[PDB]
Amino acid sequence: KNAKQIVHELYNDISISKDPKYSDILEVMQKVYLKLEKQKYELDPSPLINRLVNYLYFTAYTNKIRFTEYQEELIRNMS
């Protein structure tokens, strides 16, 4: 699984939720979606994915969000 594939898979599963607590995460991820298509991050998406992974845990803490095991697994894949 490459960066683009995992991000898309997580985005898709989170949007299935239909819980407003995830709206801010989805917002951030759409921007990550697009940046992954760019040249720079095409070569090395690592720094971008690391920022996303760190953002996910930080915001999850701040807003008391819980991810499912299925979602946590995908995040682990990213880290």
Side-chain angles (χ1 to χ4, degrees):
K1 289 186 176 179
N2 74 305
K4 287 179 179 173
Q5 170 174 44
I6 299 178
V7 166
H8 172 64
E9 171 150 32
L10 178 64
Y11 188 88
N12 181 278
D13 190 67
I14 288 182
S15 57
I16 285 176
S17 164
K18 290 188 173 182
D19 184 315
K21 70 174 181 170
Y22 297 116
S23 75
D24 289 300
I25 281 163
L26 295 175
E27 191 186 317
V28 165
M29 291 186 70
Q30 280 188 36
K31 302 173 183 300
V32 176
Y33 247 139
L34 305 188
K35 292 189 180 185
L36 286 183
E37 295 303 309
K38 290 190 166 183
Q39 302 178 60
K40 298 186 177 181
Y41 294 111
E42 192 68 60
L43 308 174
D44 176 53
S46 300
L48 180 49
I49 296 300
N50 289 318
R51 288 190 296 172
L52 173 53
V53 170
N54 292 153
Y55 162 76
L56 293 173
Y57 287 121
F58 168 71
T59 183
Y61 170 80
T62 312
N63 294 290
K64 300 183 176 180
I65 302 174
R66 300 305 301 178
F67 295 109
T68 62
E69 172 58 45
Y70 181 85
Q71 299 170 342
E72 302 180 311
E73 179 58 49
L74 286 169
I75 297 184
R76 193 170 309 105
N77 286 179
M78 294 191 285
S79 61

